[PDB]
Design a protein around this ligand. Structure first.
Ligand SMILES: O=C1O[C@H]([C@@H](O)CO)C(O)=C1O
Ligand SMILES: O=C1O[C@H]([C@@H](O)CO)C(O)=C1O
Lengths: 239, 239
């Protein structure tokens, strides 16, 4: 269980990825890295995980990703892939299993346009995590409700269970991690004028891949308190 | 030639796209829409163009794209695709001809990672267009030089003529429009510590697709002066 402890400044650079496996450089509480892990699980891809201490990074990690961000994929050929959506698309294409993106070009384009509709939400969550008082909170509630009604409208026309059809697909996994953290951020009442989006969240929680990877509110809250202080122990909260 | 005049507020909504053609909603001076037009030309795709008056938009255009931005693709089946990179990827997949993206998943992922390396540049150009004096200009020069050295490093390792190999490909067309406007913005001396990137620009200008679509400095400058004043005649400069 302590096998999951993060590597930080001073850690030895890791050795090569074994043939037959792919490696993800991750952090247990990162919603960006969660995207990639949901895909690895959904597709049944054998993999290893190296967690990175984002508040005390190893210098060698910048050789994996010059941006110094998680997630990063590394394969046995030594190829390196970064940016969460890029890593997810690469896995869908490079591995067998349930295809998570549509083959049809228009339907694929639709999933990417829905990701665009969503793309303000990660930056807002970033802002929210920093909110100081009830006035700031009232305002961020309105900002989230505007973004959520964009997403509600997609579901309203499609009349489908999920954003790509009646079966969960790539787009759902790409947006899920921010919704998972919404309870914990006290932002559930932003989805109260968006009834189909609320039902979508209930459906997501029933998905075997989502349920396997869900972090408890108490664990995310422990992480967050330490992260907001730039604690070098945040990323290993619980361990 | 006046066939290219933009549609603005009050214009009638256009009729259906004919079978055998795709329609692009564009603007002659938009670098985002230029991406899509470079792809249409590179692939030899039969198409029609409707230019939109971005400073006096038709209300119906928001039914084509709720964001109200160009480019937008519309096909004879009535499907609508927006966001410049999405439109380009859709065309590469949906049409025959020279494939502009690699089939190999890693090499495709590499092109998307290079687009990420570039992705600060459009926002910087946006800021530059607004620059007031020599001090602001000196600063933006340093910002551009930082972004350009990221791109130089890609070319340095690859030792290839273009960002995807020795043959021009999607990634080159996606980044080109901002480099085309660099002379006009007086920012050529930002590429003077980036010699491979300077050679890339010379190579791009020799490409038949790029050369066919290049706008003159004088025409772009006429456009820009009117655009900065929110002139409803900017988009039709020259007509
Ligand atoms: O700020 C971030 O955005 C990226 C990217 O992976 C998502 O597209 C990432 O990993 C972060 O930590
Ligand atoms: O500001 C813009 O960015 C978009 C997009 O098309 C690019 O990805 C666009 O068209 C604009 O006018």
């Amino acid at each position: 269980g302590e096998s999951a402890r993060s590597l930080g400044k001073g850690s030895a650079p890791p050795g090569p990825v074994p043939e037959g496996s792919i490696r993800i450089y991750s952090m247990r509480f990162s919603p960006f890295a969660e995207r990639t892990r949901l895909v690895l699980k959904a597709k049944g891809i054998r993999h290893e995980v190296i967690n990175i201490n984002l508040k005390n990074k190893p210098e060698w990690f910048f050789k994996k990703n010059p941006f110094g961000l998680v997630p990063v994929l590394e394969n046995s050929q030594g190829q390196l892939i970064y940016e969460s959506a890029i890593t997810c698309e690469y896995l869908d294409e490079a591995y067998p299993g349930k295809k998570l993106l549509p083959d049809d070009p228009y339907e694929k384009a639709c999933q990417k346009m829905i990701l665009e509709l969503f793309s303000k939400v990660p930056s807002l969550v970033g802002s929210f995590i920093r909110s100081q008082n009830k006035e700031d909170y009232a305002g961020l509630k309105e900002e989230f409700r505007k973004e959520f009604t964009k997403l509600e409208e997609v579901l309203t026309n499609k009349k489908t269970t999920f954003f790509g059809g009646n079966s969960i697909s790539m787009i759902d996994y790409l947006i899920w991690p921010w919704f998972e953290r919404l309870e914990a951020m006290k932002l559930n009442e932003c989805v109260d004028h968006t009834p189909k989006l609320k039902l979508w969240m209930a459906a997501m929680k029933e998905d075997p891949t989502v349920s396997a990877l869900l972090t408890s509110e108490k664990d995310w809250q422990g992480f967050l308190e330490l992260y907001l202080q730039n604690s070098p122990e945040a990323c290993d909260y619980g361990l």
